[PDB]
Every structure is written in structure tokens, then in C-alpha cells.
């Protein structure tokens, strides 16, 4: 407690760790939980993820704070105790990447679609230290995501923001939507205050065609859902047009 405004809240199967959750996905991918306190509103949730890739970990999004990415930092170090290779970041929005100068302070390589990078610091962030760019398909290209084991990093178009990407594990049943992708039971899509209310749909529908398999979709401000999440954020989106 740890008691959320928006996101989930506490469940079996989580684990505390300072003032930050992280929950156990599968056997090498682990979720990372941290709150930020807008007085007068109370503490938002955002996830991303952990992989165990061999033996490295990769990181996907920072907390909201370098404080709290460090806190990320420590627990990996606890529980996982293997050096930490990359980050990607999703977007140039606080919830994923408020914590880059402490990730760049500890080494890991990060890396975010170029066009998250040159927004970063009109929306307040640092930049990454790498571009990904993309194909017309929206895949990334590959010579700029060097060595990232299983993550498949896919551009799925203009949503949540015009620089949302997500990214597929290979070899688990999970994808990662970011904050593009909202629950299948959510009320709205969220901030959409930098959305593209037009191209949101096709979007929403690009990412999970990109990942056809996975049936556990990550999100970043709901516990992960089902494929119905996919289809109940692109209906969602259907009626901005
Ligand atoms: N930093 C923040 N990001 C989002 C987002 O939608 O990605 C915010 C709104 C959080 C909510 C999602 C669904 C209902 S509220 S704040
Ligand atoms: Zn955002
Ligand atoms: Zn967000």
C-alpha cells in the first residue's frame, strides 16, 4: 500500500520492494511497477518490463524518476544478479523514460525510436543514447537494434503518441503495447493529449497483427490482459474518427 490513483493495485503473486512492485511474468520476463505523486491527485502506476535473456537483462522503460530506476537497478542486482545490457525506451513521455540519466549513469546502452529521442526534451526527458529507426512496415531496422536477444521491437504507427513503439519477447506468449494499448475493460484510452486521433485505430490493430502470438498483453497503466485488450483499445480508438 503502495495504494494507486490509476493502474492496478496490489495482488498475490507481487512482490514490494522499496516503492516499487514487481510481479513475475514467466520464467525469464519480470514486470516493473513504480507510482508517481500528483498531489491533489494521488500516485499513478507505471509498468514496464524485465527480461532474462542468457545472461544479461534488458531493461523496457525507465520509472518515473532516476530515483526509482536506480531502485529498479538494485533489485535486479537482488534477484536477478546479472549485468544489465540495454534499456528501450517506448515513448518520450515521464512514465517511460523520466529515469535515463540513471540508467546512463550505470552504464546500460539505451536506445529509443529517433523520433522519441528528438521530441525528449521538449517533453522534459532525457534522449537515449541510440535512434531506432523503422521500416515503412514497421519493423525496426535491425543494423540499429544490435544484440537485443529476443526483444522485437515493432513501430506500430501514430497512437497514444506519434513515437509509441512496443516490443514482442520471442519465445514467451507476451507483447508489450506501452501506453498504446489500454485494458479490455478500460473506460478511455488515457491521456490523449498528444494522440493521433485519427491514425489511433490502425495502430492498435498494427501492433497486435505484429504479434500475432502472444496472448499476454503488457500495458503500461493496467496488470496485463488478455488479446481483448487489443481489440477493445482499437473499437475504443474507432469512435475518434
Ligand atoms: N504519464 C501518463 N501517461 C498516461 C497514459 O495514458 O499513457 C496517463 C493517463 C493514465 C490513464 C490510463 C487510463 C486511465 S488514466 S498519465
Ligand atoms: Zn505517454
Ligand atoms: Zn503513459
Given at each position: 500500500?503502495?495504494?494507486?490513483?490509476?493502474?492496478?493495485?496490489?495482488?498475490?503473486?507481487?512482490?514490494?520492494?522499496?516503492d516499487?512492485?514487481?510481479?513475475?511474468?514467466?520464467?525469464?520476463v519480470?514486470?516493473?511497477?513504480?507510482?508517481?505523486?500528483?498531489?491533489?491527485?494521488?500516485?499513478?502506476?507505471?509498468?514496464?518490463?524485465?527480461?532474462?535473456?542468457?545472461?544479461?537483462?534488458?531493461?523496457?522503460?525507465?520509472?518515473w524518476?532516476?530515483?526509482?530506476?536506480?531502485?529498479?537497478?538494485?533489485?535486479?542486482?537482488?534477484?536477478?544478479n546479472?549485468?544489465?545490457?540495454?534499456?528501450?525506451?517506448?515513448?518520450?513521455?515521464?512514465?517511460?523514460?523520466?529515469?535515463?540519466?540513471?540508467?546512463?549513469?550505470?552504464?546500460?546502452?539505451?536506445?529509443?525510436?529517433?523520433?522519441?529521442?528528438?521530441?525528449?526534451?521538449?517533453?522534459?526527458?532525457?534522449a537515449?543514447?541510440?535512434?531506432?529507426?523503422?521500416?515503412?512496415?514497421?519493423?525496426?531496422?535491425?543494423?540499429?537494434?544490435?544484440?537485443?536477444?529476443?526483444?522485437?521491437?515493432?513501430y506500430?504507427?501514430?497512437?497514444?503518441?506519434?513515437?509509441?513503439?512496443?516490443?514482442?519477447?520471442?519465445?514467451?506468449?507476451?507483447?508489450f503495447?506501452?501506453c498504446?494499448?489500454?485494458?479490455?475493460?478500460a473506460?478511455?484510452?488515457?491521456?490523449?493529449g498528444?494522440?493521433?486521433?485519427?491514425?489511433?485505430?490502425?495502430?492498435?490493430?498494427?501492433?497486435?497483427?505484429?504479434?500475432?502470438?502472444?496472448?499476454?498483453?503488457?500495458?503500461?497503466?493496467?496488470?496485463?490482459?488478455?488479446?481483448?485488450?487489443?481489440?477493445?483499445?482499437?473499437?475504443m480508438?474507432?469512435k475518434?474518427?
Amino acid at each position: 500500500e503502495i495504494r494507486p490513483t490509476i493502474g492496478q493495485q496490489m495482488e498475490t503473486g507481487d512482490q514490494r520492494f522499496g516503492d516499487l512492485v514487481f510481479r513475475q511474468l514467466a520464467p525469464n520476463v519480470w514486470q516493473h511497477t513504480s507510482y508517481l505523486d500528483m498531489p491533489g491527485f494521488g500516485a499513478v502506476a507505471s509498468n514496464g518490463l524485465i527480461v532474462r535473456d542468457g545472461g544479461r537483462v534488458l531493461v523496457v522503460d525507465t520509472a518515473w524518476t532516476d530515483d526509482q530506476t536506480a531502485q529498479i537497478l538494485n533489485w535486479i542486482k537482488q534477484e536477478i544478479n546479472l549485468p544489465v545490457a540495454l534499456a528501450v525506451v517506448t515513448h518520450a513521455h515521464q512514465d517511460k523514460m523520466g529515469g535515463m540519466d540513471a540508467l546512463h549513469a550505470a552504464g546500460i546502452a539505451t536506445y529509443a525510436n529517433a523520433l522519441s529521442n528528438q521530441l525528449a526534451p521538449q517533453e522534459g526527458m532525457v534522449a537515449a543514447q541510440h535512434s531506432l529507426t523503422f521500416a515503412a512496415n514497421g519493423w525496426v531496422e535491425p543494423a540499429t537494434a544490435p544484440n537485443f536477444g529476443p526483444l522485437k521491437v515493432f513501430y506500430p504507427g501514430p497512437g497514444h503518441t506519434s513515437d509509441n513503439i512496443t516490443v514482442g519477447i520471442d519465445g514467451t506468449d507476451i507483447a508489450f503495447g506501452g501506453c498504446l494499448i489500454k485494458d479490455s475493460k478500460a473506460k478511455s484510452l488515457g491521456n490523449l493529449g498528444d494522440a493521433d486521433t485519427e491514425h489511433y485505430a490502425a495502430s492498435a490493430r498494427a501492433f497486435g497483427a505484429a504479434f500475432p502470438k502472444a496472448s499476454m498483453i503488457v500495458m503500461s497503466h493496467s496488470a496485463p490482459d488478455s488479446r481483448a485488450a487489443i481489440t477493445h483499445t482499437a473499437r475504443m480508438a474507432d469512435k475518434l474518427r
